[PDB]
Amino acid sequence: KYFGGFNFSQILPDPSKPSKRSPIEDLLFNKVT
Amino acid sequence: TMSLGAENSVAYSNNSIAIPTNFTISVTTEILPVSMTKTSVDCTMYICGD
Ligand SMILES: *[C@@H]1O[C@H](CO)[C@@H](O)[C@H](O)[C@H]1NC(C)=O
Ligand SMILES: *[C@@H]1O[C@H](CO)[C@@H](O)[C@H](O)[C@H]1NC(C)=O
Ligand SMILES: *[C@@H]1O[C@H](CO)[C@@H](O)[C@H](O)[C@H]1NC(C)=O
């Protein structure tokens, strides 16, 4: 995941969590209900 | 469960690039509605004719 220096960790999906969603998607889904 | 298409893992490295060597002309079709059937309704003959 070395794309020259850009860190896409906040937009790439996280395989550790059971729901494969980005860290931003978690906040987007945990605030709209 | 419906499939979301094929699964292709493109190789990404800092030194490799993919350059196309040939091409193709694709003639696709796209349909778009423009107008509809203009309808004129008679009030009296529809509500109570004769
Ligand atoms: C990407 O950003 C996160 C949050 O700042 C950080 O924890 C992580 O170490 C960064 N990763 C890289 C490749 O620097
Ligand atoms: C490409 O990135 C990888 C991961 O940082 C690194 O190990 C490798 O040496 C890099 N190659 C070049 C050509 O910089
Ligand atoms: C390019 O593709 C066509 C078929 O679409 C083929 O006839 C032609 O030989 C190819 N040319 C090259 C540059 O390989």
Curated annotation (Swiss-Prot), chain A:
It comes from the Viruses. Glycans are attached at residue 7. The record marks 21-22 as: Cleavage. Precursor of the fusion protein processed in the biosynthesis of the S protein and the formation of virus particle. Mediates fusion of the virion and cellular membranes by functioning as a class I viral fusion protein. Contains two viral fusion peptides that are unmasked after cleavage. The S2/S2' cleavage occurs during virus entry at the cell membrane by host TMPRSS2 or during endocytosis by host CSTL. This is Spike protein S2. It comes from Severe acute respiratory syndrome coronavirus 2. The chain holds residues 795 to 827 of 1273 of the full protein.
